[PDB]
Design an enzyme around this catalytic site. Structure first.
Site, PDB file in Angstrom:
ATOM      1  CD  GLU A   1      -2.889  -1.162   2.349  1.00 45.83           C
ATOM      2  OE1 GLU A   1      -3.878  -0.438   2.248  1.00 45.83           O
ATOM      3  OE2 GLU A   1      -2.656  -1.837   3.368  1.00 45.83           O
TER       4      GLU A   1
ATOM      5  CB  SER B   1      -5.506  -0.857  -1.061  1.00 48.06           C
ATOM      6  OG  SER B   1      -5.163   0.161  -0.132  1.00 48.06           O
TER       7      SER B   1
ATOM      8  CB  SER C   1      -9.381   8.760   1.586  1.00 49.04           C
ATOM      9  OG  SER C   1      -8.245   8.164   0.983  1.00 49.04           O
TER      10      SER C   1
HETATM   11  N1  LIG Z   1     -18.024 -11.141   1.687  1.00 49.28           N
HETATM   12  C1  LIG Z   1     -17.946 -10.262   0.817  1.00 49.28           C
HETATM   13  N2  LIG Z   1     -18.979 -10.271  -0.081  1.00 49.28           N
HETATM   14  C2  LIG Z   1     -18.969  -9.338  -1.037  1.00 49.28           C
HETATM   15  N3  LIG Z   1     -18.053  -8.401  -1.209  1.00 49.28           N
HETATM   16  C3  LIG Z   1     -17.043  -8.427  -0.306  1.00 49.28           C
HETATM   17  C4  LIG Z   1     -16.929  -9.322   0.711  1.00 49.28           C
HETATM   18  N4  LIG Z   1     -15.770  -9.073   1.413  1.00 49.28           N
HETATM   19  C5  LIG Z   1     -15.223  -8.052   0.817  1.00 49.28           C
HETATM   20  N5  LIG Z   1     -15.916  -7.560  -0.256  1.00 49.28           N
HETATM   21  C6  LIG Z   1     -15.552  -6.412  -1.129  1.00 49.28           C
HETATM   22  O1  LIG Z   1     -14.151  -6.312  -1.199  1.00 49.28           O
HETATM   23  C7  LIG Z   1     -13.644  -4.996  -0.788  1.00 49.28           C
HETATM   24  C8  LIG Z   1     -12.376  -5.117  -0.023  1.00 49.28           C
HETATM   25  O2  LIG Z   1     -12.487  -6.022   1.091  1.00 49.28           O
HETATM   26  P1  LIG Z   1     -12.112  -5.695   2.585  1.00 49.28           P
HETATM   27  O3  LIG Z   1     -12.397  -6.827   3.439  1.00 49.28           O
HETATM   28  O4  LIG Z   1     -12.814  -4.522   3.041  1.00 49.28           O
HETATM   29  O5  LIG Z   1     -10.522  -5.585   2.552  1.00 49.28           O
HETATM   30  P2  LIG Z   1      -9.423  -4.424   2.260  1.00 49.28           P
HETATM   31  O6  LIG Z   1      -8.634  -4.221   3.494  1.00 49.28           O
HETATM   32  O7  LIG Z   1      -8.583  -4.841   1.165  1.00 49.28           O
HETATM   33  O8  LIG Z   1     -10.241  -3.314   1.970  1.00 49.28           O
HETATM   34  C9  LIG Z   1     -14.808  -4.436  -0.021  1.00 49.28           C
HETATM   35  O9  LIG Z   1     -14.828  -3.044   0.091  1.00 49.28           O
HETATM   36  C10 LIG Z   1     -16.031  -4.953  -0.803  1.00 49.28           C
HETATM   37  O10 LIG Z   1     -16.239  -4.171  -1.939  1.00 49.28           O
HETATM   38  C1  LIG Z   2     -10.514   3.421   0.050  1.00 51.18           C
HETATM   39  C2  LIG Z   2      -9.907   3.581   1.475  1.00 51.18           C
HETATM   40  C3  LIG Z   2      -8.651   2.707   1.669  1.00 51.18           C
HETATM   41  P1  LIG Z   2      -8.111   2.124   2.976  1.00 51.18           P
HETATM   42  O1  LIG Z   2      -8.287   3.117   4.074  1.00 51.18           O
HETATM   43  O2  LIG Z   2      -9.023   1.041   3.454  1.00 51.18           O
HETATM   44  P2  LIG Z   2      -9.423  -0.348   2.931  1.00 51.18           P
HETATM   45  O3  LIG Z   2      -8.590  -1.280   3.716  1.00 51.18           O
HETATM   46  O4  LIG Z   2     -10.835  -0.698   2.904  1.00 51.18           O
HETATM   47  O5  LIG Z   2      -8.900  -0.278   1.596  1.00 51.18           O
HETATM   48  C4  LIG Z   2      -6.641   1.604   2.896  1.00 51.18           C
HETATM   49  C5  LIG Z   2      -5.666   2.571   2.798  1.00 51.18           C
HETATM   50  N1  LIG Z   2      -6.252   0.609   3.733  1.00 51.18           N
HETATM   51  C6  LIG Z   2      -9.644   5.087   1.859  1.00 51.18           C
HETATM   52  O6  LIG Z   2      -8.525   5.630   1.574  1.00 51.18           O
HETATM   53  O7  LIG Z   2     -10.491   5.582   2.569  1.00 51.18           O
HETATM   54 MG   LIG Z   3      -8.755  -2.867   4.991  1.00 53.00          MG
END
Ligand SMILES: Nc1ncnc2c1ncn2[C@@H]1O[C@H](COP(=O)(O)OP(=O)(O)O)[C@@H](O)[C@H]1O
Ligand SMILES: C[C@@H](C[P@@](=O)(OP(=O)(O)O)[C@@H](C)N)C(=O)O
Ligand SMILES: [Mg+2]
Ligand SMILES: [Mg+2]
Length: 306
Positions: A15, A150, A281
């Protein structure tokens, strides 16, 4: 005049580029608010010297392993430097999605059905009944590395036939992987700043899910702040997020990701302890709706440092 604040950005996780953009933002915000802030990149500078350098506090704008996992916070705790965000335990716990899940589910909180795999089990061959527990989740399903952000390393698999390639990509980023039931959506995020939860944001991606590109690169992503939910659901969201926040032991500031499912219930995805602050963000979006300027928010986060 005395009082130097170090703004940690960049780093080496996957990231990194996002973090340089969050740092640039916070640096200006803090300076606009009267702070003598300095940009420090741990890939360039030995952060183990932050104290010998004259810095009074540290604003952490790193994203991912190395900055959000508790190791960096551990060092600053022994060095004696107040810093932004959660402590060692909460940060280490929030970075690991498999462990945030056990904890959450163990506390009675809504977590989507899942299956965890280790790289070793993968290399040895999925003992077919492994697939029996994965097929019980229903299709489609989502594969994600345990310690990323991300949307790095993730993918959607429609039908069991596609599972191998998905797992191979995820294991390139972590040795522990989660395969979880695909939730229908919509999707939401709720930021916390101190003892207050900012108005909810509903995210609307153009493609399959909120991917890397939809988060930082495309202008097709739609956001609605507040969410547009009836007070009854808006109330239920905050209650859930607040319980999720306190069970984890987080503090200072953060942002929790949530999603709706076909049974009309909310499900916790994960909690982020050092959120993005770029122009794309979510946290800055929520504060704006809450009437604060980017400078005010950043200045407030530093006020909460300990
Ligand atoms: N169980 C799920 N079902 C559907 N979409 C999901 C699920 N888990 C994650 N996502 C999708 O994947 C994106 C990233 O997953 P997340 O767990 O929030 O991890 P990261 O830290 O990479 O953001 C989410 O914002 C959503 O759009
Ligand atoms: C889209 C989001 C990213 P982030 O904060 O969170 P996610 O893990 O959902 O990507 C990330 C930097 N780790 C933002 O900048 O607000
Ligand atoms: Mg996350
Ligand atoms: Mg997320």
């Amino acid at each position: 005049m005395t009082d130097k604040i170090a703004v940690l950005l960049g780093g080496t996780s996957a990231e990194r580029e996002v973090s340089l953009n969050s740092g640039a933002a916070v640096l200006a915000g803090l300076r606009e608010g009267g702070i003598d802030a300095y940009p420090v990149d741990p890939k360039e500078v030995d952060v183990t010297q932050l104290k010998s350098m004259g810095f009074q506090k540290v604003f952490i704008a790193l994203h991912g392993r190395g900055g959000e996992d508790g190791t960096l916070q551990g060092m600053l705790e022994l060095m004696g430097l107040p810093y932004t965000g959660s402590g060692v335990m909460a940060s280490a716990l929030s970075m690991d999605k498999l462990r945030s899940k056990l904890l959450w589910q163990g506390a009675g909180l809504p977590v989507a059905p899942w299956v965890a795999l280790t790289r070793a089990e993968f290399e040895k061959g999925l003992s077919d009944k492994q697939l029996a527990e994965i097929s019980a989740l229903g299709l489609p399903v989502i594969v994600k590395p345990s310690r990323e952000g991300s949307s790095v390393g993730m993918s959607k698999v429609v039908a069991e036939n596609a599972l191998q390639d998905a797992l191979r990509l995820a294991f390139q980023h972590d040795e522990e992987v989660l395969i979880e039931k695909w939730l229908s959506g919509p999707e939401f995020t709720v930021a916390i700043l101190g003892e207050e939860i900012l108005p909810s944001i509903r995210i609307q991606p153009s493609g399959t899910f909120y991917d890397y590109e939809a988060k930082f690169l495309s202008d097709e992503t739609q956001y609605f702040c507040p969410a547009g939910l009836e007070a009854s659901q808006e109330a239920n969201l905050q209650a859930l997020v607040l319980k999720a926040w306190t069970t984890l032991g987080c503090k200072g500031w953060g942002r929790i990701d949530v999603m709706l499912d076909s049974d009309g219930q909310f499900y916790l995805l994960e909690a982020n302890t050092s959120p993005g602050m770029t122009s794309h963000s979510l946290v800055p979006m929520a504060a704006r709706q809450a009437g604060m300027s980017f400078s005010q928010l950043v200045v407030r986060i530093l006020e909460l440092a300990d």
